[PDB]
């Protein structure tokens, strides 16, 4: 009692600590990597566990073409993704690479199996390289959602976003002096 | 399900989350979208530019299948060829047995020029092309054609 605790102190913050998903595979993986980090203190494992706790809206997908373009100076390393890897038909040919992901499309899996690559699961990554030796951690673009592009106030002079519905008039939509 | 709803956790509290001074009344601001230029002017100006007024010419009956116009970019062309034929054609950069693609048979009218092409001759038939689409095609050894 009788103490001042609101003068140089801010309110607490809330962060995720558990995956939140019913899928038992993700719970198992999160717990295993948390144990590994507890017993080694490595940064790769810490970031991996944090990523495994993220929500689906914060885990964008990654294409094979983007993966190829990102492995230009490091073809011998292992690409690690905490999301699904999809196919890119726009790319006629793909090189040989090693990728570890949560999921693969059937087409992406088959394309990687051809060309001599290897598709890896997080279970095998834990079995072989628990601390991520010779591994690169990658993610997609978090601002690519269509919902993200409509945040803000369309009618203000300094915003650069569009209104949400369909608008047919002219008042305030044809320059700074349309009002 | 009603067991897990927020309203069931307000039994015993008298006003159910609507306040004492204000309270829950019927229509304290009006019905629908009324008041857009009067007491709701700030809301409409912040979020809905171009809501009031007219703009452009009017067509009394739009012909919906005349305005239809699908398009394909030059970087999606090779995905129309199945994989086995794909590797066969790519291996031999033949000039006498080049693949012939008719995008109208796949449901497209005009060809646009986003992306790039594999370095191999090809013949593409469409009803229209963009300026750059033709330029990129001829730099890879292909030729464009117009199909009925």
């Amino acid at each position: 009692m009788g103490i001042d605790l609101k003068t140089g102190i801010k309110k607490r913050k809330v962060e995720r600590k558990e995956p939140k998903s019913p899928n038992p595979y993700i719970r198992l993986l999160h717990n295993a990597f948390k144990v590994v980090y507890e017993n080694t203190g490595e940064d790769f494992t810490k970031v991996l566990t944090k990523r495994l706790c993220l929500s689906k809206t914060n885990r964008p997908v990654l294409s094979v073409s983007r993966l190829a373009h990102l492995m230009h100076k490091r073809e011998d390393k292992i690409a690690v993704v905490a999301s699904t890897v999809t196919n890119d038909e726009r790319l006629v040919t793909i090189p040989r690479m090693t990728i570890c992901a949560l999921k693969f499309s059937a087409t992406a899996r088959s394309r990687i199996e051809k060309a001599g690559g290897r598709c890896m699961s997080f279970d095998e990554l834990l079995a072989e390289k628990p601390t991520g030796d010779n591994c690169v951690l990658l993610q997609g673009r978090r601002s690519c959602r269509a919902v993200c592009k409509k945040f803000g106030s369309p009618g203000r002079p300094n915003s650069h976003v569009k209104p949400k519905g369909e608008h047919k008039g002219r008042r305030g939509a044809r320059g700074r002096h349309s009002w | 399900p009603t067991r897990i709803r927020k309203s069931r956790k307000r039994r015993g509290h008298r006003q159910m989350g609507y306040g004492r001074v204000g309270g829950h009344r019927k229509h304290p601001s009006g019905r629908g979208k009324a008041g857009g230029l009067q007491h709701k002017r700030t809301s409409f100006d912040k979020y809905h530019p171009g809501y009031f007024g007219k703009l452009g010419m009017r067509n009394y009956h739009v012909r919906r299948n005349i305005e239809y116009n699908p398009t394909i970019n030059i970087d999606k062309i090779w995905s129309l060829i199945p994989e086995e034929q794909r590797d066969g054609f790519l291996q031999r950069k033949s000039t006498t047995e080049a693949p012939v693609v008719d995008v109208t048979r796949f449901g497209f009218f005009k060809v646009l020029g986003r992306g790039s092409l594999p370095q191999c001759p090809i013949i593409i038939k469409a009803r229209y092309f963009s300026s750059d689409a033709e330029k990129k095609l001829r730099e890879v050894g292909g030729v464009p054609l117009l199909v009925p």
Partner: peptide, 30 residues
């Protein structure tokens, strides 16, 4: 500040009187 797209649904007609404008599909299997 509420930022929503405006609804484009018509108000109901003939709800307590007049012709019956509600169609149910309980007889689909039959």
């Amino acid at each position: 500040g509420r930022n929503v797209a405006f609804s484009n649904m018509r108000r109901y007609k003939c709800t307590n009187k007049g012709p019956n404008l509600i169609k149910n599909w309980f007889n689909q299997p039959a």
